[PDB]
Amino acid sequence: MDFSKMSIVGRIGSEFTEHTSANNRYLKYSIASQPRRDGQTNWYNITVFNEPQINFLTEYVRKGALVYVEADAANYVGTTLSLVQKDINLLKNGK
Amino acid sequence: MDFSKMSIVGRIGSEFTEHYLKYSIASQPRRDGQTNWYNITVFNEPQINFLTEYVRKGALVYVEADAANYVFGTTLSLVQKDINLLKNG
Numbered sequence: 171m172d173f174s175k176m177s178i179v180g181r182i183g184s185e186f187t188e189h190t191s192a193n194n195r196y197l198k199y200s201i202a203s204q205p206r207r208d209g210q211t212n213w214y215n216i217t218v219f220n221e222p223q224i225n226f227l228t229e230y231v232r233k234g235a236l237v238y239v240e241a242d243a244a245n246y247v248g249t250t251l252s253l254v255q256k257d258i259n260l261l262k263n264g265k
Numbered sequence: 266m267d268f269s270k271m272s273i274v275g276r277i278g279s280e281f282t283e284h285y286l287k288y289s290i291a292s293q294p295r296r297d298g299q300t301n302w303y304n305i306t307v308f309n310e311p312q313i314n315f316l317t318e319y320v321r322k323g324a325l326v327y328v329e330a331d332a333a334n335y336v337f338g339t340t341l342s343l344v345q346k347d348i349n350l351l352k353n354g
Contacts, residue, residue, distance in 0.1 A: 172275050172292045174301050176332060180267045203267040205331075212269055212334045243271060245301045251334065251341050 174243040218255040234264030269332040286313045307345045323354030
């Protein structure tokens, strides 16, 4: 019924840091997004649990890649934004 | 071209406080699970007048908002671009 989803286009501005939850493997990275040249540069911390998408990132995607990310958004209340990745399309890969 | 669009379906769980307009959306995807709260900023006055004079608290709405997250910790900003009333409060 209710949901909060977000589409993000920008450059991967960090490395792919692997983690393991207290239970499960997941990945974390950051996306730098600047819609207007005269405007604010936005940063988003992405979380990836889907293993087929984790393998595609750590293997083929490099830092500085232009990506289109769709993520489910959650706001944990002092609020913290959570962006669990659901799909990604590589527009241009990093150097 | 970079962007960060947010799509929310939830219940307006606050009053419309004027400063531009500001309110909160209660988005609970699961009956058992957590409720997500999003502070919505509205600068579009044609949509400001629609919110105050037609929408009541607790109404189910679908909102498209642009997201901006500044790093200092981060600060999330959601500027409503368009809204559709699903069921009024």
